[PDB]
Ligand binder design. Structure first.
Ligand SMILES: CC(=O)O[C@H]1C(=O)[C@@]2(C)[C@H]([C@H](OC(=O)c3ccccc3)[C@]3(O)C[C@H](OC(=O)[C@H](O)[C@@H](NC(=O)c4ccccc4)c4ccccc4)C(C)=C1C3(C)C)[C@]1(OC(C)=O)CO[C@@H]1C[C@@H]2O
Ligand SMILES: Nc1nc2c(ncn2[C@@H]2O[C@H](COP(=O)(O)OP(=O)(O)OP(=O)(O)O)[C@@H](O)[C@H]2O)c(=O)[nH]1
Ligand SMILES: Nc1nc2c(ncn2[C@@H]2O[C@H](COP(=O)(O)OP(=O)(O)O)[C@@H](O)[C@H]2O)c(=O)[nH]1
Ligand SMILES: [Mg+2]
Lengths: 360, 428, 441
């Protein structure tokens, strides 16, 4: 069923920032969220289903990473065992610390390693001679509407890209043609692979910051569930398959300010197109929720199209967005909320239905 | 200072170009030698949109031809206007595909496409600033579909900032001049909804019914059916070649008319079409054209529009006119017939006007429209398609060039999915 | 001395300018060929004033105006037209592609490497005069060349030149009529960017002049010339103060003060009272009471905005010709005596008056008639909130389905930008309904 469940987070100040005394602006009154332009002209108000807080380490309802995992991840790990595909997104501009929320650090681990570790744990709980579990992995990206590979190395001649395709099987949905799939049992192994993937990622320094991204990044984990053992002879009449797709996304990248023509501009354009189409897709899902019949523009983009079976249908999803509270960065921050306004899924709607008179 | 290139594939594209250059040459004052015998300077200020120049005031076009069989080449050259074209641009090969899309996307076109692009690059680089590309290719058949689609793909990998546009004939319900129209057509749409900014559907049946009813012609011919397509093509760029109180271009018609990008299949129309006696019994005013244009029968799709609503339409009038009357008539059209229009667009019409009219009339007009009623066309093809593919009728001639069943199934979805999009807006 | 740079943009601005100069030249006694038979015969007089017309030692006059586009079909019509040997042949074209009626190409992809030529010529024109520099920029909503380029130019001229008077005789979108299907977007964004930099921004519309021309002058088949001559006579009715001599004159710095109470509310309307042909020029007295009553009629307005559902925050009247000011004061009193009109409580003065001695003139081949007086009205009112409340409702629909966007993001824009302007416009609506509340003590 339709399970969008968008979330938003608020980081703390840095040490550098607390030295410079970044003027706090973003405030709360619990579930509702407010912001106050330092001109003190108007107050914008945003509601979401869920609201975390990581600015004051002492305040009630504090959002530590344990809370993040224990509230968002666990339904995914649970549903995957039921045999359903799931997906998790991530929005956020550079400086809002998506790296802190997803990956985290050794003393405050983020989401990824917790999810993988709990998967390992439940595997080692259910692992009997009656049942087996196989886990396979893969990693790719999106850049100027093309597709590449990251896990796989390349030729030491020049910019030896990895040109790939997207094709459609009539049953299992779309896939990639030429892709590397690998096997896993150790968390350290996936950490190694993930580092090897994130190194080759498509990036470029700018006047803003050296470490910025220009390419979306998919991390795919295929799960397998083999139980079918015929009582009158060993025979796999079927085996359940279930997918997990994490993805990292780039920013909104207003280009009227960062006026640096060439490729830096021709990549941000495609990036924003992908964001737009993803937003349309989620806004369509929220209406699919309500029993109404509608169209979905799956085929209009690429990253939507390699997700078609994991996003739609009986599939549980999510999304989160890191931000920055420092009033110096309000503009980018506002878009970082204005993209995720799906809280009003079905409010203030007219109704006209007459299908009564069911009688003799 | 801007530019348009013309590519011409298959039999249809070549026989159409042989009447399009015949109409443009008659408007800019050109003669079969490629010389000038016009009357007004105003025809030469923007001749550099379609034509190049030459040594002795001769003018030569940016026309390119493709065909994989010379059976048309000598038909053009041995004609009235087959000799100004640049002989280095008459590309060809041999051993035509024989209405097999596979032979014109994989095998032969793979040999000829670089020889085509070697000329396309020459004709591009010799321009100052570029706007977009034009093309004239049939579907259903072979060469024009396969090689044309391939050219589109290679270009929009090469030159994506700029525009692309096609004037593509389509198959028809009643009669088919080829037994494998649906298959080739579906495979063509799989590679033309992605890599296009606008394409204009034309259907032979509509031209026939038009020429039977209105002009009351007795002995038509393909060469005179093409006279309406050349007219339309001419009108679409009249905003570009000439002045205008409210100018336009190709890109303007693209932005205004294509709300979401995949729905870029048009339904054209021209006015005032009348018989050789019945022009005395009519008046030349804006409403006399406006009632003729939104009629069901002056369209070229063989698609009853009144089975559906119009997402957006356009219009290009030509002559000394009164814009108040134009805008008022369009207001009344959006008023009386709201059911044939969409509510979530407030003004489903725009305009565009030029003040330099054609050689023989005081007034003229073209009409363009993105209607939902194209839906019933594609419902045919898929239907026509799938029952044949349920039994694999003519498959092996297509698998015999390194293909797979997979490549068909994809295409089918990409049409059916598209159809569903239109139906989303067919209801209120 | 007093001077005014004029900067036309887009097919609206240039087709307007070719009329404004046709009129200005016929007033000051000039032939289109630059020279001056008039003062050649008088042997004196400043009448070819240095306000608009720079002057060389060789007797030839060159106007202080420039105009731009990115589609040279227009400027070539000038260069070949009747007026080719008048203007400076720095008529800045970069007509390599149009704006596609999007704000994005006009303000960013083809707004870079091109704007600097315009700024250079503007400096070249300013450094020629040690005097007033009140800008007049004639553009039009909807289009890209007239929305985005203007939005880029004003925000830069506010940086270079700062505290000078900047104005805009912009054109408005008709609510029913349109020649486009993207005017709402391309209008709301422009309002957001130009709410701050500009000082006043007059507004006219295309539907009201159509309806006028069918009503009064008995015209059946208008064009896109006849309307522009009315815009040009409006502009003359303003600039007569700066050029010519008479009783009560109004410089450009006065309009921005008297009519812009708050910084954000600077979007007035406009009107010309006498509009008549050679037949109806007779059979009528043409007093001042008749005129100043006609100026407030609903039909003689120039935007389709009923004022009776609104209130006049401020108003300025500029007359011409043989005038007797006690008639003007009697007219103002007769106006405030009425009850259909409603002024606010915080402006019992409201009115302003400016008089000039010159008559109007005629553009031969035109519908208007030789008279002995004429009048112009400008108003900052509150009915026009409706003409914004519709536009956002023409916006909120489309954006609900993220439509007509993919081009825009395709030329360097963030979608969330839309979601800012809708707010900064909505706040504006609240202001036009905040002030309408009368104070309480
Ligand atoms: C002497 C005269 O004026 O007769 C007309 C004429 O009778 C009519 C029927 C012309 C005639 O058109 C046809 O014969 C015709 C018949 C069937 C299908 C298509 C065309 C005409 O042949 C066509 C021709 O139209 C033009 O000249 C336009 O420029 C047309 N170009 C050409 O016809 C042309 C083609 C090749 C070489 C030279 C000229 C055109 C239309 C749109 C944009 C650009 C050009 C004209 C005026 C007429 C004749 C000659 C009878 C009409 O032409 C068009 C397409 O608008 C058919 O309806 C109009 C109305 C005219 O009244
Ligand atoms: N009053 C008047 N308006 C005009 C005239 N010509 C065009 N317009 C207006 O121009 C608007 C169309 O957009 P424009 O402002 O012209 O944009 P543009 O000049 O084409 O510039 P681009 O959009 O970049 O192509 C419409 O609202 C018309 O009313 C004219 O001659 N007189
Ligand atoms: N309108 C029009 N259509 C044509 C003409 N000649 C061919 N066609 C269309 O072109 C199709 C034939 O495809 P074709 O171009 O011959 O394939 P090719 O042999 O590979 O080039 C048919 O469906 C016809 O409808 C013509 O003169 N006029
Ligand atoms: Mg323009």
């Amino acid at each position: 069923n339709s399970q969008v469940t968008v979330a938003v987070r608020v980081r703390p100040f840095s040490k550098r920032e607390k030295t410079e005394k970044a003027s706090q602006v973003v405030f709360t009154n619990g579930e509702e969220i407010t912001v106050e332009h330092p001109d003190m002209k108007q107050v914008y108000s945003f509601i979401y289903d869920v609201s975390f807080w990581s600015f004051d380490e002492c305040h009630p309802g504090y959002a530590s990473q344990t809370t993040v995992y224990e509230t968002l991840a666990a339904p995914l790990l649970d549903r995957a065992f039921e045999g359903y595909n799931t997906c998790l997104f991530a929005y956020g501009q550079t400086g809002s610390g998506k790296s802190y929320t997803m990956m985290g650090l050794n003393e405050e681990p983020g989401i990824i390693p917790r999810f993988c570790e709990d998967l390992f744990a439940q595997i080692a709980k259910k692992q009997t001679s009656e049942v087996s579990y196989h886990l396979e992995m893969s990693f790719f990206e999106v850049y100027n509407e093309k597709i590449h590979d990251l896990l796989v190395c390349k030729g030491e001649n020049g910019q030896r890209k990895q040109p790939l395709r997207a094709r459609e099987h009539p049953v299992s949905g779309p896939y990639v043609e030429g892709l590397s799939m690998n096997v896993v049992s150790s968390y350290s192994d996936i950490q190694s692979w993930l580092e090897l993937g994130n190194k080759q990622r498509a990036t470029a320094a700018t006047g803003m910051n050296d470490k910025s991204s220009r390419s979306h990044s998919v991390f795919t984990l295929v799960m397998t569930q083999t139980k079918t053992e015929v009582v009158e002879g060993e025979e796999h009449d079927h085996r359940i398959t279930s997918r997990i797709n994490l993805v990292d996304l780039a920013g909104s990248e207003r280009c009227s300010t960062a006026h640096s023509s060439g490729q830096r501009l021709k990549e941000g354009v495609s990036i924003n197109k992908s964001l737009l189409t993803l937003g349309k897709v989620i806004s369509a899902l929220s209406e699919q929720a309500n029993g109404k019949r509608v169209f979905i523009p799956y085929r209009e983009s690429t990253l939507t199209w390699l997700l078609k079976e994991s996003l739609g249908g009986n599939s549980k999803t999510a999304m989160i967005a890191t931000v920055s509270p420092a009033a110096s960065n309000i503009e980018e921050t506002l878009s970082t909320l204005r993209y995720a306004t799906q809280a009003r899924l079905i409010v203030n709607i007219a109704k006209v239905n007459e299908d009564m008179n069911a009688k003799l | 200072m801007r530019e348009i290139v013309h590519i011409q594939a298959g039999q249809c594209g070549n026989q159409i170009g042989a009447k399009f250059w015949e109409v443009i040459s008659d408007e800019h004052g050109i003669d079969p030698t490629g010389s000038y015998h016009g009357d007004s300077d105003l025809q030469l200020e923007r001749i550099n949109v379609y034509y190049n120049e030459a040594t002795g005031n001769k003018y030569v076009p940016r026309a390119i031809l493709v065909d994989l069989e010379p059976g048309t080449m000598d038909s053009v050259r041995s004609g009235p206007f087959g000799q100004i074209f640049r002989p280095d641009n008459f590309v060809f090969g041999q051993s035509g595909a024989g209405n097999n899309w596979a032979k014109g996307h994989y095998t032969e076109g793979a040999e000829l496409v670089d020889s085509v692009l070697d000329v396309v690059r020459k004709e591009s680089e010799s321009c100052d600033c570029l706007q977009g590309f034009q093309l004239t290719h049939s579907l259903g058949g072979g060469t024009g579909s396969g090689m044309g689609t391939l050219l589109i793909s290679k270009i929009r990998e090469e030159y994506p900032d700029r525009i692309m546009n096609t004037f593509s004939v389509m198959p028809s319900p009643k009669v088919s001049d080829t037994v494998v129209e649906p298959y080739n057509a579906t495979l063509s749409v799989h590679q033309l909804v992605e890599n296009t900014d606008e394409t204009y559907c034309i259907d032979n049946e509509a031209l026939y019914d038009i020429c039977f009813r209105t002009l009351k012609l007795t002995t038509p011919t393909y060469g005179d059916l093409n006279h309406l397509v050349s007219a339309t093509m001419s009108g679409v760029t009249t905003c570009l070649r000439f002045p205008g109180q409210l100018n336009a271009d190709l890109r303007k018609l693209a932005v205004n008319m294509v709300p979401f990008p995949r729905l870029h299949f048009f339904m054209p129309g021209f006015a005032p079409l009348t018989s050789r006696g019945s022009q005395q019994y009519r008046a030349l005013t804006v409403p006399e054209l406006t009632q003729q244009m939104f009629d069901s029968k002056n369209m070229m799709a063989a698609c009853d529009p009144r089975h559906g609503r119009y997402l957006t339409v356009a219009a290009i009038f030509r002559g000394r006119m009164s814009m108040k009357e134009v805008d008022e008539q369009m207001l009344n059209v959006q008023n009386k017939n709201s059911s044939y229009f969409v509510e979530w667009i407030p003004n489903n019409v725009k305009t565009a006007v030029c003040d330099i009219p054609p050689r023989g009339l005081k007034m003229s007009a073209t009409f363009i429209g993105n209607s939902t009623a194209i839906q019933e066309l594609f419902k045919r093809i898929s239907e026509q398609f799938t029952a044949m593919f349920r039994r694999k009728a003519f498959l092996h001639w297509y698998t015999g060039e390194g293909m797979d069943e997979m490549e068909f199934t994809e295409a089918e979805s990409n049409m059916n999915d598209l159809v569903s999009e239109y139906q989303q807006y067919q209801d209120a | 001395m007093r001077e005014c740079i004029s900067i036309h943009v887009g097919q609206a601005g240039v087709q307007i300018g070719n009329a404004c100069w046709e009129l200005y030249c016929l007033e000051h006694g000039i032939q289109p060929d630059g020279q001056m038979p008039s003062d050649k015969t008088i042997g004196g007089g400043d009448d070819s004033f240095n306000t608009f017309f720079s002057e060389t030692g060789a007797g030839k006059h060159v106007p202080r105006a420039v105009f731009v586009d990115l589609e040279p079909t227009v400027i070539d019509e000038v260069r070949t037209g009747t007026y080719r040997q008048l203007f400076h042949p720095e008529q800045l074209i970069t007509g390599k592609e149009d704006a596609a009626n999007n704000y994005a190409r006009g303000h960013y992809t083809i707004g870079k490497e091109i704007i600097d030529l315009v700024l250079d010529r503007i400096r070249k024109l300013a450094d020629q005069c040690t005097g007033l520099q009140g800008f007049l920029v004639f553009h039009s909503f909807g289009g890209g060349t007239g929305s985005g380029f203007t939005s880029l130019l004003m925000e830069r001229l506010s940086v270079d030149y700062g505290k000078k008077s900047k104005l805009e005789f912009s054109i408005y979108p008709a609510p029913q009529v349109s020649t486009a299907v993207v005017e709402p977007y391309n209008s709301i964004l422009t309002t957001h960017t130009t709410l701050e930099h500009s000082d006043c921004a007059f507004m006219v519309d295309n539907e009201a002049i159509y309806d006028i021309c069918r009503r009064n002058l008995d015209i059946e088949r208008p064009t896109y010339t006849n309307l522009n001559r009315l815009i040009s006579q409006i502009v003359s009715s303003i600039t007569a103060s700066l050029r010519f001599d008479g009783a009560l004159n109004v410089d450009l710095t006065e309009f921005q003060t008297n009519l812009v109470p708050y910084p954000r509310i600077h979007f007035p309307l406009a009107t010309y009272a006498p509009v008549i042909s050679a037949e109806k020029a007779y059979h009528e007295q043409l007093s001042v009471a008749e005129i100043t009553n006609a100026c407030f009629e609903p039909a003689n307005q120039m935007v389709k905005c009923d004022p009776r559902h609104g209130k006049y925050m401020a108003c300025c009247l500029l007359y011409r010709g043989d005038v007797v000011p006690k008639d003007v004061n009697a007219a103002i009193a007769t106006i405030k005596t009425k009850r259909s009109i409603q002024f606010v409580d915080w402006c019992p003065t409201g009115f302003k008056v400016g008089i000039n001695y010159q008559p109007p003139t005629v553009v031969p081949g035109g519908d208007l008639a030789k008279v002995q007086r004429a009048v112009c009205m400008l108003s900052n009112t509150t009915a026009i909130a409706e003409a914004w409340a519709r536009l956002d409702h023409k916006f909120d629909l489309m954006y609900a389905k993220r439509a007509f966007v993919h081009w825009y993001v395709g030329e360097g824009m963030e979608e969330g930008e839309f979601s800012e302007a809708r707010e900064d416009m909505a706040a504006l609506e609240k202001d036009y309904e905040e002030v309408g509340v009368d104070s309480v003590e």
